[PDB]
Nucleic acid binder design. Structure first.
Ligand SMILES: Nc1ncnc2c1ncn2[C@@H]1O[C@H](COP(=O)(O)OP(=O)(O)NP(=O)(O)O)[C@@H](O)[C@H]1O
Ligand SMILES: [Zn+2]
Length: 682
RNA sequence: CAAGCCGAGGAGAG
RNA sequence: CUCUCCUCGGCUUG
């Protein structure tokens, strides 16, 4: 391992106590300075006959294996014992015991918190911080309100204040936070920015920040920025299609008699549709809620039309209505006035919309703009042409990947492309799996795919190869994502583009984040040059305030929903105001999954075979007689006992009918009994 | 590989 | 404070 000139000075105070933060730019060898500090700490604690254990904390799963393979093990295999832990191994089970060996631990975080609270809640073995001598951290800037890793530090600070009251002493460990930039936390002034930086430093018990300032030229030579760049377009033709949908929506409303006080093709209208649906369901009146459920789909179609082709919206709708027709046929294998009206309104115009959509006379601007942007680079760079795209949604990524596969020009220039999204199981899309992600990364590194389409997955964590033409298509989150993307593009003649529309304030937000970036550095300078006594005074005040802001939050949120009422309810279907279950019939397995095993509920539903699995069904999707999907099948002890949700159902209390929607099971106060086979059997 | 439970952060709009 | 979008983590059934 090598010791750069400028990494030295930033690391230097850490080597003798002095818990600190380190903010360097991106690509400056952050992991490697971590490694060096580790080796020093351990060699030191050996030379003094003192036990030395370092633990690395990360936020993601892949960075653990990552750092185990590339940085820590290749250099410290020979002197010390290393390991890498996560939620995707089997070493989680005896975590108190791996500590008894393996002087270098890498870990996902909440492993640790689980073990601490197990030591402090049950009679398990567990662990405390006293069994360490260093905590290294990646991505400092997540240390904010009740995240994970701040429990850790609130406990560290609690014990530190115990030590300080003792002084007027357990040996507490050392802490070394590493980041790219701690970030201004949503503050409209330089002073509140300062306050936020100090809040971070208190939540890490720091002594300084240690930005590089002296050996700066070596950085500028070894490390460089891309060039910021904007590309803007404007559109007022909307020629056949938009109005062809606004007509439909207007017709539906004037069939429903609901006045939005708002516009078509935006986000407030959506919120109205939601609360109207929820109200109609709490009341029970149809003709309003199902229509709302469709209007939401139309609004989504218009929003994606603002960014994506008409054909993608037409397809989105085709999928929706095709599914609904299949549902009604599976049920009927009756035809209310509502659904009949809606279908008759849609399918008559289906062929028209298909004709209007395929019309290259007016496709879109931003797509053409990025066409020009992309072709410029891949004509310039010629087989060293890596590429990245950022967008907001997942469906957009599928659409863009499809298009770049379809249009000949992009394939001509060697533009081999793949999509990428996250593994969260929500949001009406089939997510990806970690394996597909890692494979795509290795394909990018290999060179199979020249450009990647991504959501906010790409701006942090996983280690993509250095790039050229990072762009930004309809996304401005905050300064952090801005800088982290801005730190991808090495490989000279790099850029950082932003592609937006005219009448949607985005360049606004881009500029705001630029000013925030320029502000946090001023605040860093304000605090590094702060006097030590005043700095100490302020961090002590903030640590006290943070620990007091925990206690209160603890006092008002012990349970907040505790009234356990076994069967005081009835669960109805939300589409059709129809009985489905009572609360007594329901039970729980492994105190997590809710389920019912009475034959009355058995006969009411229908199973529609899986499209997720076709990409032999194992987990059927339930539907009603009406058509509203309810749940999913489940296999407990071979019993195909069918699970369910509480997002599609409605509640009716027996007393006075404040019917409510909950969106998930924990929110409601009442408790349900555990399962046991004594019922239906014996 | 599929299903689901809980928690957390960020951003928009209101 | 609510809704939507996005990401992440831990945990269970198969
Ligand atoms: N001190 C060092 N000496 C030699 N090579 C280094 C050093 N630090 C980093 N490298 C090289 O830089 C690459 C890994 O470091 P780097 O690119 O900073 O990854 P990183 O830690 O993820 N940067 P970042 O994305 O900001 O966290 C490899 O090609 C290493 O060979
Ligand atoms: Zn129903």
């Amino acid at each position: 391992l090598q010791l750069r000139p400028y990494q030295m000075e930033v690391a230097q105070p850490a080597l003798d106590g002095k818990n600190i933060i380190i903010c360097l730019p991106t690509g400056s060898g952050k992991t490697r300075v971590a490694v060096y500090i580790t080796k020093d700490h351990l060699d030191k604690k050996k030379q003094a006959s003192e036990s030395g254990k370092v633990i690395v904390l990360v936020n993601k799963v892949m960075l653990a294996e990552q750092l185990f393979r590339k940085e820590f093990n290749p250099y410290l295999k020979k002197w010390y014992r290393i390991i890498g832990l996560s939620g995707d191994t089997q070493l989680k089970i005896s975590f108190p015991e791996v500590v008894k060996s393996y002087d270098v631990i890498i870990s996902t975080a909440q492993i640790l918190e689980n073990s601490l609270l197990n030591l402090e809640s049950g009679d398990d073995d567990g662990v405390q911080l006293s069994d360490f001598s260093l905590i290294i951290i990646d991505e400092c800037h997540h240390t904010n309100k009740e995240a994970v890793y701040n429990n850790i530090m609130r406990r560290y600070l609690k014990q530190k204040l115990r030590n300080n009251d003792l002084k007027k002493a357990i040996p507490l460990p050392q802490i070394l936070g590493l980041t790219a930039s701690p970030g201004v936390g949503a503050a409209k002034k330089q002073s509140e920015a300062e306050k936020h930086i100090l809040n971070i430093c208190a939540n890490l018990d720091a002594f300084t920040i240690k930005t590089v300032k002296e050996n700066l030229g070596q950085l500028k030579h070894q490390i460089k920025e891309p060039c910021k760049k904007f590309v803007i377009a404007d559109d007022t033709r909307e020629n056949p299609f938009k109005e062809k949908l606004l007509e439909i929506m207007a017709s539906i409303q004037t069939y429903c008699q609901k006045s939005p006080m708002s516009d078509f093709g935006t986000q407030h209208y959506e919120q109205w549709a939601i609360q109207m649906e929820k109200k109609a369901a709490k009341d029970g009146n149809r003709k309003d809620r199902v229509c709302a459920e469709h209007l939401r789909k139309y609004n989504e179609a218009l929003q994606i039309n603002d960014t994506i082709r008409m054909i993608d919206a037409y397809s989105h709708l085709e999928t929706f209505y095709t599914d609904e027709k299949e549902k009604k046929f599976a049920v009927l294998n009756k035809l209310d006035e509502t659904d009949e009206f809606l279908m008759n309104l849609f399918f008559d115009n289906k062929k028209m919309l298909k004709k209007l959509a395929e019309n290259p006379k007016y496709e879109n601007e931003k797509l053409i703009k990025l066409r020009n942007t992309i072709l410029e680079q891949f004509t310039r760079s010629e087989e060293s042409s890596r590429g990245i795209i950022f967008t907001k949604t997942r469906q957009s990524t599928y659409a863009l990947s499809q298009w770049i596969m379809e249009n000949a020009k992009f394939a001509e220039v060697g533009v081999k492309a793949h999509h990428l999204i996250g593994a969260g199981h929500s949001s009406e899309v089939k997510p990806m799996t970690q394996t597909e992600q890692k494979e795509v990364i290795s394909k990018f590194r290999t060179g199979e795919i020249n450009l990647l389409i991504a959501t906010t997955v790409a701006e942090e964590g996983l280690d993509i190869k250095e790039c050229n033409i990072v762009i930004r298509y309809g996304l401005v989150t905050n300064e952090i994502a801005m800088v982290q993307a801005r730190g991808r593009a090495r490989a000279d003649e790099s850029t950082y583009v932003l592609v937006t529309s005219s009448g949607s304030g985005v360049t606004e937000r881009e500029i705001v984040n630029d000013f925030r970036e320029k502000m946090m550095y001023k605040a860093i300078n304000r605090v590094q040059n702060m006097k030590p006594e005043e700095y100490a005074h302020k961090i002590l005040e903030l640590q006290v305030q943070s620990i007091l802001e925990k206690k209160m939050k603890v006092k008002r949120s012990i349970a907040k929903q505790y009234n356990d009422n076994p069967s005081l309810i009835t669960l109805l279907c939300k589409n059709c105001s129809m009985l489905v279950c009572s609360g007594e019939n329901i039970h729980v397995i492994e105190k997590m999954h809710h389920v019912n095993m009475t034959p009355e509920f058995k006969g009411l539903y229908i199973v529609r075979e899986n499209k997720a699995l076709q990409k032999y069904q194992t987990n059927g999707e339930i539907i009603c007689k009406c058509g509203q999907a309810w749940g999913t099948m489940m296999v407990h002890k071979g019993l195909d006992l069918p699970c369910l949700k509480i997002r599609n159902f409605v509640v009716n209390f027996k007393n006075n009918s404040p019917k409510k929607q909950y969106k998930k099971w924990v929110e409601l106060p009442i408790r349900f009994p555990d399962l046991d086979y004594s019922e239906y059997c014996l």
